[PDB]
A and B are shown apart, each in its own frame.
Chain A
Amino acid sequence: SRAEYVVTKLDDLINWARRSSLWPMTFGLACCAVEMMHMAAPRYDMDRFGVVFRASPRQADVMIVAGTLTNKMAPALRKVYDQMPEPRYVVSMGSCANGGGYYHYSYSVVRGCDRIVPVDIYVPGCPPTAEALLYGILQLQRKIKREQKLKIWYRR
């Protein structure tokens, strides 16, 4: 009955909850939002995995940056992220969000959403196949599987 073992199992439970219930946010900027939809569609049923689009940041757990991020939109994106409550994850979807993409050298594009918010997972493509975005969601699920927070608290 070691407290370290108990804490590891408790953390497994915490992560299982926060993982099997990932409510993203209805935040789609450009084409990549269409593949987001298609990943919400019958062929790839999101809710099947526990994923549910909630429109309020105060209820969401992750935000998928699904398209190009202009300088006129970055403040709103950072504000929304700030308004999401911890634990909060972020997913960059496409090449526009990762590094500006096809509009990298433009005067009105931030060359990466990773400049305005911190990104956990990068999904490449223009657009990323909905299958790929799902692969990224599950990659995030596993990353959450590997948080080990309470073990750290107990080791402190």
Chain B
Amino acid sequence: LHHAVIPHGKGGRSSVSGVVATVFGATGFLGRYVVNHLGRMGSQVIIPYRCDVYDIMHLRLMGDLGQLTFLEWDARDKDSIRKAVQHSNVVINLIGREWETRNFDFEDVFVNIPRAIAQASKEAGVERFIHVSHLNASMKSSSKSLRSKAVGEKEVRSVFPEAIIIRPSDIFGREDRFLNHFANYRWFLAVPLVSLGFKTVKQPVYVADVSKGIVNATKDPDAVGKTFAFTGPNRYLLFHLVKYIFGMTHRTFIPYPLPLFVYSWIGKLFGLSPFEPWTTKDKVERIHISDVMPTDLPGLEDLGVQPTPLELKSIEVLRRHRTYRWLSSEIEETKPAKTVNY
């Protein structure tokens, strides 16, 4: 270890961790938690951003002086990546997107960009490269995002064979697109589900556990070159999950069945939004795709994390949707969701 990387201190905001990370995608739902957990134990975080400097403020405070170093980059410009990974010992590609744009395709974000980042990280002397694929990812899935993600992790491993690949499930938090989505269906007065939610399984995990797992894989020497499956402890059926949601939200739950060949058309329409669409055909298909069973893959308890069940961390997400009549309602008033094995 270089004399400036030896860890010193007790693991506080002003300590040293020995970690010099370059986090691609820090301006997202998960990147902010990752950067918080990194700057919390005194590590250097290099945060390349394409967005406006006004959208990195919430990050500017989650690290001591000099621990956060921001940079302007572009996915197409390869030098923008070399300059970022030029001094790191870790790289964390969280780049992703739940919809395609005028200028970017699922392929572009899930295959090429990770592949270039990995080429540069390898050529630059990086020791670790953490990639975040999906749990349900496969070259044989109906959704295009999952096919692209599987191809992308294949390429990342063909360019960086020691790349830690992390495969989480539908993540839930405050700024998420899963519980807030299943809560905001209410604006349409009813919940359209395929097969009435049955036949579908969801094993969701809290984002803080995922960030802890990433930050611990940063410095866990038994994790190099391994795949992980970050999944929650309990499996649910989409029906009972959404019912528990509307219970915490205390809204009226009117579920009706809906075949997928019209729900996907609905999703296309909604996706035509030139802004951030409220839903998409790919987000639809990603829903209603059952959740793979652990199938021997390592996990959070092997990284050093005890998963947090949804029944403890749902209200801090779903109290924002309640009305004045139900705000103060406690957690125990809501009947928990049925758990399954399948």
| Chain A residues at the B interface, C-beta cutoff of 8 Å | 87, 114-120, 147-149, 152-153, 155-156
- The docked-state distance in angstroms from the alpha carbon of A148 to that of B54 is 10
Contacts of B51 in A (CB 8 A): 152
Q: Mark B45-75, 1 if CB is under 8 A from A, else 0.
A: 0000011111001111100000000000000
Contact yes or no, B101 A149, CB < 8 A = no
B interface residue count range (under 10 / 10 to 19 / 20 to 34 / 35 or more): 10 to 19
* Cα distance, A147 to B50, chains bound together (Å): 12
What is the interface of chain B, defined by CB distance below 8 A to chain A?
50-54, 57-61, 101-104, 275
Interface of A is mostly: loop
Q: Could you tell me the distance between the alpha carbons of A117 and B50 in the complex, rounded to whole angstroms? A: 22
**Contact call B60/A156, Cβ cutoff below 8 A:** no
Q: Which 5 pairs across A and B sit closest by C-beta, in order of nearness?
A: A118-B57, A118-B60, A118-B61, A149-B52, A156-B101
Question: For residue A115, which residues in chain B have a CB less than 8 angstroms away from its CB?
Answer: 61
Which B residues are CB-close (under 8 A) to A114? Answer: 60-61
When chains A and B are docked, how far (Å) is the Cα of A46 from the Cα of B103? 44
Minimum CB–CB distance from B298 to chain A (whole Å) comes to: 35
- Chain B residue nearest to A87 (CB atoms) is B54
Q: Which partner residue on chain B sits nearest A116 by CB separation?
A: B61
Interfacial chain B residues near A148, Cβ < 8 Å:
52
The answer to whether residues A147 and B54 also contact, given A155-B103, A156-B101, A156-B104 and a CB cut-off of 8 A, is yes
The CA of A156 and the CA of B61, in the complex, are separated in Å by 26
Contacts of B104 in A (CB 8 A): 156
Q: How far is the CB of B97 from chain A (nearest CB, A)?
A: 9
Residues from chain B with a CB closer than 8 A to the CB of A120 are: 57
Question: In the complex, what distance in Å separates the CA atom of A115 from the CA atom of B53?
Answer: 18
- A149 in contact with B54 given A115-B61, A117-B61 (CB within 8 Å): yes
Q: How far is B51's CA from A107's CA once the two chains are assembled, in angstroms? A: 38
A155 contact set on B, CB distance < 8 A: 103
| Shortest Cβ gap from A86 to chain B (Å) | 9
Interface contact B52-A147, CB-CB below 8 Å: yes
A118 to B50, CA, bound (A): 19
A120 to B54, CA, bound (A): 9
Chain B residues with Cβ under 8 A from A156's Cβ? 101-104
